[PDB]
Amino acid sequence: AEIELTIDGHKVSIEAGSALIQACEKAGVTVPRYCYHDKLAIAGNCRMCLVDVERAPKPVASCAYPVAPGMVVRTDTERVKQARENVMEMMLQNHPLDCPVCDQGGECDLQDQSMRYGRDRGRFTEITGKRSTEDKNIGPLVKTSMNRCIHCTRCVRFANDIAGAPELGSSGRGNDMQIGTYLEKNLNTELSGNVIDLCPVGALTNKPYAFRARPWELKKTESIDVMDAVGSNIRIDSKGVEVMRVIPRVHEDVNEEWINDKSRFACDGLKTQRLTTPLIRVGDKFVNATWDDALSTIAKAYQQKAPKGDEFKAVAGALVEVESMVALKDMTNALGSENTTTDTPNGNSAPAHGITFRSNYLFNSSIAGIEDADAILLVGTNPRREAAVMNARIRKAWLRQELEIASVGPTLDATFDVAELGNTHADLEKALSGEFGEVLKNAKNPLIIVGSGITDREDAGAFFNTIGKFVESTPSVLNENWNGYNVLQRSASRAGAYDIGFTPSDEASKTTPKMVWLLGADEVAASDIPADAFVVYQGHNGDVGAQFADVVLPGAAYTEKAGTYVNTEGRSQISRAATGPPGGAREDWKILRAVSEYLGVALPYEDAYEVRDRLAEISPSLVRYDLVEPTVFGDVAVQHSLVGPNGSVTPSSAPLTETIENFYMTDSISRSSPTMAKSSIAFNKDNKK
Amino acid sequence: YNFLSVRHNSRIRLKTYATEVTPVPSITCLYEGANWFEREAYDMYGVFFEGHPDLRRIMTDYGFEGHPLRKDFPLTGYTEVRWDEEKRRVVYEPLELTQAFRNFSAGSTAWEPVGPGRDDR
Amino acid sequence: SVHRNTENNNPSIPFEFSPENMKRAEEVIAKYPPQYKKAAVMPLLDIGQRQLGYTSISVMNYVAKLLEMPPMRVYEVATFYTMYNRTPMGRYHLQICTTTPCQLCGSDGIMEAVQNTLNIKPGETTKDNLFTLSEVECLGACVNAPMMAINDDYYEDLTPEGTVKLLEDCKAGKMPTPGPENHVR
Amino acid sequence: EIVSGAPAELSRNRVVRIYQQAKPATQSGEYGTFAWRLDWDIVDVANRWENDLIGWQSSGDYMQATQMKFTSKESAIKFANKQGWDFYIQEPHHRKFRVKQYANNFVHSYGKLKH
Amino acid sequence: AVEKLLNVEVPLRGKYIRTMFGEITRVLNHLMSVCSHAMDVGALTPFLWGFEEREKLMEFYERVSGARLHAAYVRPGGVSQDLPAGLLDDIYMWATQFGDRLDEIEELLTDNRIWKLRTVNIGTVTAQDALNLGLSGPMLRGSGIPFDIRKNAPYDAYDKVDFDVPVGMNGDCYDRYLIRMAEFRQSLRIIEQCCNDMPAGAVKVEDFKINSPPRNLMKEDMEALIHHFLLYTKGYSVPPGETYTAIEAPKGEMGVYVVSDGSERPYKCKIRAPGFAHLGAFDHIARGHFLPDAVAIIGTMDLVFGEVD
Amino acid sequence: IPEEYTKQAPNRDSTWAPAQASKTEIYKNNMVRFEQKDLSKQPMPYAGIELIAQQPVRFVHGNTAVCDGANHNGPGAQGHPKIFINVDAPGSHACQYCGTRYEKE
Amino acid sequence: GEHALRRYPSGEERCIACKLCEAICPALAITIDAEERIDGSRRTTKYDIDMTKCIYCGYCQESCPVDAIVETPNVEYATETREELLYNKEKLLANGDKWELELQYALDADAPYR
Amino acid sequence: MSQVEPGWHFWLGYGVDTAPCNTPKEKLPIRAYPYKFQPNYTGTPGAFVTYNTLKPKISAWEPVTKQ
Amino acid sequence: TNVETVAVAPTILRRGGDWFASFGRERNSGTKLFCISGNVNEPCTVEEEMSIPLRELLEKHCGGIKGGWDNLLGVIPGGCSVPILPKNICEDVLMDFDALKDVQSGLGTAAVIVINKQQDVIRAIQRFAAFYKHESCGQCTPCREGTTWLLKAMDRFRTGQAKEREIDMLYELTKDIEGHTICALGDAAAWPIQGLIRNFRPEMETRMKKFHDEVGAVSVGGWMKDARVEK
Ligand SMILES: Cc1cc2nc3c(=O)[nH]c(=O)nc-3n(C[C@H](O)[C@H](O)[C@H](O)COP(=O)(O)O)c2cc1C
Ligand code: SF4
Ligand code: SF4
Ligand code: SF4
Ligand code: SF4
Ligand code: SF4
Ligand code: FES
Ligand code: FES
Ligand SMILES: [Zn+2]
């Protein structure tokens, strides 16, 4: 299972039958490459990674020559170097001259690795023309210049293997290979926008970023994703006030190379309609005002209404930070009561799995172990519509291994061959007792993934007690070294919200609200409003909620702060700010501390570290980062998630509706971008065939 | 230290290592061309010296603390402004807030070279 | 210049196949294992080609639907093969070999004779839509190098006189001919 | 500990970041892997505002753009405690071994087929 | 210092034009030094007469550089661009008269009894002390050690040109005057033979990995564009390590000490200036004089304080 | 932020904005310091948006169009570098260095 | 000289915001912002030269590949405010529109040497 | 100075042997059609001033309230 | 398997192993088929002994050379992808594999094309360049851009636009494609031009003599000017 090979004095042992480039990169030897990639299948196309191997007449392609035991491998024979110059010359004398106006100026990997391996006189005459290539439209989200495509075929392999939209095929021979389609139809798939970070030349590129920047002006900054519960691995390109674009950084457990395609275009959703100043309504006449004026107006209105007991319904918004939610819960409990629910359509009730025993709550299997699962089934969700990179790992496993996959509930087209078994709870219990009671018990480490959309419904009862009772009642695999019972969330911060323990408590839920803390709660805001509203909308990008507001608080978004976030697997991941907040726009937990000053019940903590100290005092899984093992309550948690909500709700046969209609317009950032409006109207006959 | 021969037309270099904490002795006891240069070394670094007369500042402002060629504090400096209107002619500093920050160069290619070594032995 | 062009010019997914073609297609598919089942795609495109000349995007989409395939892989097959003519083509596709032995025995003058007869640039078709020119490379048959092929078969050993007689005849009268004489020696 | 040559009150006020520079996903090439970076945060009110006359971005951070390039994380952190300000370290993330038979172009009975 | 650290060598056209430009620069520096010296001493006419052909040397920069006196004309990879024709034709006709006018400014200072008591054995610096002071250049060779760099560590084609170096005998300011006044009429020979021996060849470096591509074929070629692009974005690769390089600037030995990271930007550069060493020696030299002695002894040792730091 | 105007200038020879986010209002452009001033400070850009409509479309019956932009009096190369563009579909007549429109006929 | 922006014959504002003239201005006196303009190509949204801090190294001219920023020979200066020095896009396009005759003489004696 | 139309400014600074009213093929790139030539306006009330071209970078929200 | 190497299989399993081993060389063996075409007297096809004189092969079985033995200019042996033997070292070599492999020619197809001396070798090899342009697949990066650049060069060599060093530049760029593909189609494209620089260059220079000022003074107004290659 290990083999020594010698690359130029560097002996190194790697696994048998592996890739020679993997040996070179383990040996710390830089080998130039264009059509190799890590998480794609190997093609021999780019012909650059040539290396000299003993007992071989030709320098073989190190991307695909498998590891033979005990090889002598030279990357520095003059045949190798003075053939690499040869191959780079014969890659460049049909490339166009777009280098000043090609988007990847300091990132054309061809251009980057040209000077140290290349050759000056690309031989030409005015008589000679190279060739031209027809530009092609792949979608209004991706700008495309196919003149530059060096036919690395990384795009094709990505659209086939990982994306599952095979609509980007190759075409033609000779000079006349074009990539895309000659039906001229737009790609409208999930995670399409990974491909512009993937084509190593600037043939594919970003449409709203198109020419705005060029990568040495850019304070490239580590941060954590939003608009998905997975807490993806982003990195923000910043010009200093504006945010230019995002790049998915590498993080091998959680979504190793990819971004959710909604998360790629928060930049056009950021700098467009932010709340820069507090706004107050005279009434249908909505004027901005001084900060202290608005604070004193809020405190004076609180003293006017005096909502002392079991009132002032704060509600967890979609996209916030843990520290603001800690300030929210602590300020409400300091003020006198507890009424904090979430955005969900009538989730003014417990999520039918207790805040006790953390393992019951989140996606407690590892994201990598998804490709270690024998056969899984999904209920109440469309994982293409939510957490698209989770769908990417699903397809990665489904092409790798043999998995029996079934959807139950919503009718979904996902690219890994589900077997839908009804739109009803009775169909669910039938399918569990019928044949997956054989499969999941017979299989080795199965998983069972549930949507958040079922927790929205009043059918969080018998529908959810059925699957919990099945988890207990099939205890043979799902107890000790594996935990299949898992849910996903729509938003990221709802995971940390249920971690801190926002309570929907029925002693307080059966009352009417008279003060409302909206934190971006665009979804629930049409219903939950009284006449005596006094809606305090804190946040940014006032799409919905500011339109229902009484006082606007211009909160800073995720980009401008060190928002410690929780994924849907319980990992704490801490951010960094990449720009200051625009305008007045102070930071959110500081806003709630100042409200605690004016609405005169002050918090016991005000500096930066004190927030983290109280957060450690609340749940110390959130101060130790990105490493979770909840092995201790794998068995008692399903008892305490089953017996509680048992039979309080008769199983309603209302069908399992689609959780998200428009994926592209969500979350009060992606809700409000002219990128996502264009991609949302990319549904038409152009996409269909 | 770079030294120069006269009879032999031959340079040499001589290195020590010193910490901001602990000094290393000067070489002004041997000749007189030192006591200006070691002032320059002290001013640019805070590499403190020893056995030396007149270890002043030359290369900065006279009330200016910090040491510039340490890679601790950047190009702007901490307090570098000057203005004189109200407290008259007292050209007193502030927090140095520039008018456009030195937008850096943070690009880097694959790898420069591997050296073709040569030694006599 | 084998091009990969649009699909606008009145070829917009409206066609099918016919009765005996589906039976013959099932006969073709039966030569291939039941799982891992694509490899009949090239002869099935030939059956579509002989059913409907100038194999359009429509019959290709019908094949891709028929053999459970995503369509771009079928396009990726029919982007290679010069058999799969796309533009509308006349009754007799006229393929002149202009490769090296065919060059060295005078197919150059044969193409000159054809373009004197049919004033057509060698990548175009006749306005009558009776003939469509294509210079082609070596069909293997370097037997009598001034040969050409016409839409099915090979006509060995052509003088320009025999060529223009064939262009007169293949307007109406068929010439089931290898060559003027019989044998190869 | 008192700072000897640091005239600011940096040492009590700001959070600094020790991080391995991330592997860029756009280019292939990995020279940013082999450093360690010190970076002061922008957790500020100064924090690069907008100018009003020409419209540059005049900052207020006297040490906005500054990067050390260290060698080892523990040498980095021994410096960071030696000159003495509040840090936060960030662990890098590798890429995991996966065996790549180039021959992954073969099947049994199975529905899906690829390029 | 950089091209030593690149292991490259500029072609012969580049070495000859940098050598002749180094020697008109030497004419310019010693001319402005003697002129500002004599203005501080008190005579105004040598100052203005010398600036009259400093203006011609300003033009000879200007027909090459982009400005009058500062220039980005040298590069690490050789220079910016080859000369224009009328420059090389004119510079002979300049050097035809410059010896005559150098004699003309020489006739009223070198001989008079003023400069013979205005400069006496004044600021005598012995060689045992001058070596111990870190002095160099004109004051060193005024103290009678026949050593510079150019004849002794020959950078950039001073090897190939007949070059004779004046040597002092007395370490005063008078030989420090006369040694500059000899270096004029030694540098004019260099301008003569570099007008004669001027080859034809590439005036940048030969490859295009390191300096700049030629601007003609940067618009007809892929590779010329990528080299142009990266040479003006990321600078370029420099191999790691240290170096130090000293040449005799006309104020003394300038040293450049560069520690290169192995990256786009120099990890450390330390200059070394004769105007920072001679200024350091000034206290040991100035003792036992008067103030109008000290005014002259500033100007002798080339104290232009833009070469302090 | 108040009520004041001086109707003497549109955007350019073109009437409206030249591109995305290039405004021509003056009040947001700090009307404090335009006062006592001629308005004959230079509005000289003619907004090259208008100058492609000045330009006539060029036809090439090949398939690949070379573009230089260089003059036929200059001794040195002065135009934009040699981009080869395609004339294949009608519409893509755009040399991305000059905006000269190349149509296939 | 003073940084006049050239255009083509019938000029479509020859600068493409290619940012090469940014990355070598050794006092960072260049501040550019760019955008895809309406007609498809890329143009300069704003173009900024700190004539406070332009050393006149000419590297801007030595690297702008379409030869669109050009050092003039004109010494036409001496403003009374800094606010009359900070050249925006309109000043430079105006300055190139004021003369290209002199610049055409300059390039046609220099471009076979640049 | 600056009353000189700057095509002649070489011929007053010796940028060319030939007077600029000689060659027509060198002299004509001009179809940027007006040539108004403001000399210099410094100290004059109509001095040049400057301004950001674009708009603010962040685009504050518009106060629209629903019910 | 090749169709001809499997066509002999039942006959060679009904006859003995010594039957096929009776012929040719000590390592090369048996009879192989010959398709003889090009500008010859009688274009024909036979199935004959390996290791025969090519002159006896032409003269005894296919008429001969159209023009006779003193009117060839080159012979293409074996494949299309084989270098051309000259008129003197085609006289007495063999028709095997291994000895002709020692005369640089791997006769892997055994299909012989013979040319009159009154015809252009340049047009033949240029036609092979266009052949590989129609037949390069697309996976190899060097093969496509290679064949395109070779076609662009051989058009210049037909018309005589090249310079004397461009011959060796062409040889170097053919050496660039000599071992750097996936399949041997690129090597097959690299063989005829490497055969062109071998045994030849009086006639490259003779065609290039037929005008002056190579890389001619042109302008490229909207298309190119002053010359063009094929369109
Ligand atoms: C680019 C290339 C093209 C080839 N074309 C043919 C062909 O058209 N007909 C043929 O019989 N062999 C052809 N071959 C040789 C095949 O590889 C052949 O099937 C192989 O040599 C089988 O060996 P065999 O002769 O023992 O059967 C080609 C080889 C290469 C590299
Ligand atoms: S990909 Fe674009 S930026 Fe990179 S070398 Fe090619 S043309 Fe230039
Ligand atoms: S689409 Fe991009 S990544 Fe894919 S082959 Fe083309 S240029 Fe390469
Ligand atoms: S001339 Fe020099 S200082 Fe001025 S903008 Fe150009 S590069 Fe910068
Ligand atoms: S160098 Fe050219 S393309 Fe780049 S910003 Fe300057 S004028 Fe524009
Ligand atoms: S040699 Fe083969 S694989 Fe390579 S490009 Fe040519 S046909 Fe394709
Ligand atoms: S990936 Fe290794 S050669 Fe193309
Ligand atoms: S010679 Fe052309 S077909 Fe065989
Ligand atoms: Zn153009």
Coordinates of C-alpha atoms in Angstrom, one line a residue, chain D residues 53-57, chain G residues 31 46 48 50 86:
Chain D
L53 CA -12.9 65.0 -3.9
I54 CA -11.3 62.6 -6.3
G55 CA -12.6 59.4 -4.9
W56 CA -9.7 57.4 -3.8
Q57 CA -10.0 55.3 -0.7
Chain G
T31 CA -5.8 55.0 -9.9
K46 CA -12.5 56.6 -14.1
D48 CA -6.8 59.2 -12.2
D50 CA -1.9 62.1 -9.2
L86 CA -5.6 66.0 -10.1

